[PDB]
């Protein structure tokens, strides 16, 4: 019963998932392609309700995306059996260290080799246009594309991803955790049903599970590096104000 409840919590709480992303990325109001600054402003005229630099505008749209995903992950976590029973400070700790690992995992679902869906599926910005931006904004998304290409080569579906994200959140070695024994047992259950699910769902890949353990470690490193870019921007970029929720997450991480 654990696997089904987690998959349903994922379907209930994330506005965007892999099935919906592929349905959009294939056609069937097709996405407006943002490949240069002229198509950027055109998309912003049609979609967004600024005079700031375009890099700062893409920056503020990305963080609003992250704030909304953090809200979705919080509701998702509360639906993980056993999560709500933890001390409130333990739930905060799990979310604080878990959300960006989950975010970059789930971001892979909207990414291909050419770019990524944006604006709740209404736009598609190209990998090259993000590289064409001025430093340091050009260096933010490329490591996430690199991770996503290798992650997407595993060909997970939403049922696999939902259990994987639950395992990320329910991680007993986060700094400052009080009830480490209870959380470790929660994780052991999630990982157990994840392993059974990978065997049933991917019988062709008997090594899928250790592959995914490595992805959890790569994600931790991807987020550690990302947090360093956040601090660079908080210190050295004029108009790049950071959302208070996100600064609280990155603070002391």
């Amino acid at each position: 019963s654990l696997a089904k409840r987690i998959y349903e919590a994922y379907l209930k709480n994330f506005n965007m998932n892999k099935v919906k992303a592929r349905v959009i990325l294939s056609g069937k109001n097709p996405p407006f392609v943002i490949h240069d600054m002229e198509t950027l402003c055109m998309a912003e005229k049609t979609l967004v309700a600024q005079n700031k630099e375009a890099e700062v505008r893409i920056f503020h749209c990305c963080q609003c995306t992250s704030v909304e995903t953090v809200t979705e992950l919080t509701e998702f976590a509360k639906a993980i059996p056993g999560f709500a029973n933890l001390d409130l400070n333990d739930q905060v700790t799990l979310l604080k260290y878990g959300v960006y690992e989950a975010i970059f995992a789930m971001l892979s679902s909207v990414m291909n080799k050419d770019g990524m869906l944006v604006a709740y599926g209404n736009g598609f910005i190209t990998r090259e246009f993000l590289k064409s931006l001025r430093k340091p904004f050009c260096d933010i998304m490329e490591p996430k594309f690199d991770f996503a290409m290798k992650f997407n080569a595993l060909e997970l579906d939403d049922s696999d991803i939902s259990l994987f994200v639950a395992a990320i959140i329910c991680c007993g070695d986060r700094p400052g955790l009080l009830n480490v024994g209870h959380i470790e047992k929660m994780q052991e259950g999630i990982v157990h049903v994840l392993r059974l699910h990978l065997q049933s769902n991917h019988p062709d890949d008997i090594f899928l599970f250790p592959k995914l353990l490595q992805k959890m470690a790569d994600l931790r490193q991807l987020v550690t590096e990302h947090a360093q870019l956040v601090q660079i921007i908080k210190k050295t970029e004029s108009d790049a104000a950071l959302h208070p929720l996100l600064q609280e997450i990155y603070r002391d991480m």
């Binding site: 953090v70 919080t74 739930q91 905060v92 979310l95 604080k96 609280e248």
Partner: peptide, 11 residues
């Protein structure tokens, strides 16, 4: 409460 706490305390 923190902002994370506020999200977690919502019904």
């Amino acid at each position: 409460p923190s902002l994370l706490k506020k999200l977690l305390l919502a019904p």
